[PDB]
């Protein structure tokens, strides 16, 4: 999840389906 982030890039719009594409916080 983009809110779970730590990153500036996926904090954008909390556009989580942008983030999880990239970075890793499934189940
Ligand atoms: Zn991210």
Redesign the pocket.
Known sequence: E?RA?S?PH?RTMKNVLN?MT??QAGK
Request: aromatic share 0%; glycine share 0%.
């Open positions: 983009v982030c990153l996926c983030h990239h970075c």
